[PDB]
Amino acid sequence: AELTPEVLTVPLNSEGKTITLTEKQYLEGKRLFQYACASCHVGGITKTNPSLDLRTETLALATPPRDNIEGLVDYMKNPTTYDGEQEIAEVHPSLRSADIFPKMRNLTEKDLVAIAGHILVEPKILGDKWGGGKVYY
């Protein structure tokens, strides 16, 4: 098995456009995801709220939909509750809240797209292990 462009092709937006990452953007998104998110989101769960994971099925039923790069980049800029009704920048790291979440300060739009790609690619690789928690370890 290997890391092929079919694996590395994810929805760019909700209108079905796709985009094809490189091995390098995927590895970068992995490192950046470890640096900035994995303290809470290791393996695609959420330690401080396990009801919400990073599975693509879950991301797809979010409002707005988050199973695409632009939806995820927008979430890193201006996060909201699952139903879109509340902005939560105050308690979730985002560019909007980089003053209180310093690790988000040095992040560029290229970084956010890498992180988003990594989140979208990993379930295609790991399947149920991503967002499954310890049952699947």
Next chain:
Amino acid sequence: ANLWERFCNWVTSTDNRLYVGWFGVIMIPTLLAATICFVIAFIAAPPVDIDGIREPVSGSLLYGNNIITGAVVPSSNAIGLHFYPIWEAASLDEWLYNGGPYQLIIFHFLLGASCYMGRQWELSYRLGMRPWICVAYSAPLASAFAVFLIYPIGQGSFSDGMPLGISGTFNFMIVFQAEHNILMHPFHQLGVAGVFGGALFCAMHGSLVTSSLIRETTETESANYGYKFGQEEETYNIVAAHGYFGRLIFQYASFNNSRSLHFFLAAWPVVGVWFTALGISTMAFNLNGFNFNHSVIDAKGNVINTWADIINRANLGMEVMHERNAHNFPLDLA
């Protein structure tokens, strides 16, 4: 002579059948207190709410245990590290419910065993011996401190101290593996080397000296009668034993110097057990065994399990089941 000096001569007398000594003045009361409390509690104490969740665990023989399952149960998690002497309880009944005997026993015992160690120094001084037997004992002593004192300190509760029982010990070991992966910790691996090697070298030494006993008896009598207590001459031929053992391996892998040989016998198990005691004492602060969980992945990123991942599956079964009613939140952080 004045009373004080007569008392001091008695305390430090080398003619008492059991040496008392100044360390003994504290050792004796504290060991007696702990021993009497332990025996009474093991036979008759009522169930103890170890985990603070109003779920008493029965530890005593009269309440349905046998020798293997019985224990003196650790004090309640609700107490944590608070000091719970008898006089802090409203009643003995309260003190028993919350596991007070465990504190009384372990504190008097740790104090008494520390003085046991000092007493070994003390008699060696009165007899004109070299002083370091007590250093050898420091290895088991430190081990006891780790499981009864240090590990509770780091984890915040005597309820996570080692129980005073046979099955309670096993419980402690299993939970420890789940929360710290002690098998994958090198200080425990060093402890195993210490005790496997200690048993190896114990059997080696006994067998090589026994192999080279000098003929002093007939086939009818015990060969033990060829040694007389106090005899000036050695009862075995160490050159012969060296000659056997050097050829079994090769000449320089064998000891010719009795003093070097016996220091090696002392050093190997003591050092190894120092390390395993230090293992418990540093995993007390959650510096755990090596974690190779999902360390091997393939070209695509599939996880390729190793034996470490299989250990992790067992660990997870221990984790999710232990103290099944005691956790409300998803991480078991102590």
Next chain:
Amino acid sequence: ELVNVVDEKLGTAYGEKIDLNNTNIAAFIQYRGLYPTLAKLIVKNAPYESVEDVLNIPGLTERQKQILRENLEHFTVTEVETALVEGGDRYNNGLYK
């Protein structure tokens, strides 16, 4: 004459749909737009006699009533089971991942 009431419930609609009277609040994540805002209101407004009573919750926006109508097919109501609703278990039932 001795039955596990929780196993019995699995044989009702509770075992198939979100039971507005019983089900833990985390189940409303299954369908779009219900969590957290509407799920909180549904749980707080407590037991309902019929599924459609959920549309009469004081304060819904027109948007919220629409989302709710879109999801009525995913709801049911059965009788309140004490063992499921005591202990604050509709908000946290001891299950994480």
Next chain:
Amino acid sequence: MEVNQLGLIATALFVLVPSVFLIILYVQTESQ
């Protein structure tokens, strides 16, 4: 506790028979 009733005699004989053997040997050692 619903223990095995033969446990008592098994334990008693387990202790008694070997112990008596040793005592017999020791006492007749002392008297010569």
Next chain:
Amino acid sequence: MEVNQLGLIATALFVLVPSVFLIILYVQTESQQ
């Protein structure tokens, strides 16, 4: 038959304990010469 189960250990000790006493005394008599 529904006998007293303690009758077994009672009988066993009733035989064993006095018998062992006599054997102890006999054997140490022989080894005196």
Next chain:
Amino acid sequence: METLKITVYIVVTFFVLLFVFGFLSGDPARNPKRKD
């Protein structure tokens, strides 16, 4: 309970003072060779 507490305090105090004073009572000279 107060009575138990006082009694232990006194017992403990007594044995600790014995230990302290005993070792202060010239302990280095209590050995079989050099009496300092």
Next chain:
Amino acid sequence: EKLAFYDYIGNNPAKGGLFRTGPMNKGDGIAQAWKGHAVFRNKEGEELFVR
């Protein structure tokens, strides 16, 4: 009931046996309750007494 229980031969100490071991409860059982005083009558209403 305590007085009635004395008036019962099962508590008479001369009703035992040498090898009937253990507590009195092992024989007739653990007394739970007095059933009441039994009065016997024949068909002519006369009161009769058990010997």
Next chain:
Amino acid sequence: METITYVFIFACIIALFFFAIFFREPPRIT
């Protein structure tokens, strides 16, 4: 009966300790 048995055996061991220490065969130099 099983509690009595366990305590009995333990009590015998403590007694054995007493005799083993105070009524040992004394070691003699010779």
Next chain:
Amino acid sequence: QTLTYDDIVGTGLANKCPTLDDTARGAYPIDSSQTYRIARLCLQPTTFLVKEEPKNKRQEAEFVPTKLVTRETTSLDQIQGELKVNSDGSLTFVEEDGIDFQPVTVQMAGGERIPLLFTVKNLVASTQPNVTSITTSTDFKGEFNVPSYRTANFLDPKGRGLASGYDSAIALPQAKEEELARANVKRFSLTKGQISLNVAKVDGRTGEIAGTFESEQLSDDDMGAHEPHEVKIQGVFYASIEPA
């Protein structure tokens, strides 16, 4: 006073309700047009009595005293609810929320431990009609729910539970299940208790009242495995009334 946490911590006073002066014997006027609240209701138990289980004969059972073994963990506090003025002039307190339960274990003579869920959950307590003032002869009487002492996820020592756990005795694979059913099949009880609250102290200025209570409820039945005991709890209470 402005006692701070650091003044109180570890003394046992955190489990005590506030008290009122012996001179607080006034009356709190109740204005029927107005709507009232209990901003804080505190109940501090001082004695737990358990009804004895008399043998067969059917002689009388008394409430016998017991020894508390779970320490200063017993008080209910920060309870709040609406104080309703009813049309007959009675007052009704309807609990909304608060720290309104404490598990308690007491011990009977002979060593039997009795756990119980000391509680006034969903308390509804009412005065007599036509109460124009709360005074030092005002009484409230009410009832409350007593849920199972363990809730549905609780696993017994062999791993059996209601909402989780084994459904059988797995250590006895081929035993007859019929004699084990009461232990295997867990049940969640909901019962009612009754409480009297007797106002003995009233600061008409501040709206604080205090007094004694007596509660009756059932103890733990271990999710159906044994019969519960009847328990009577007595103690003291404090409340603060604020216009709402």
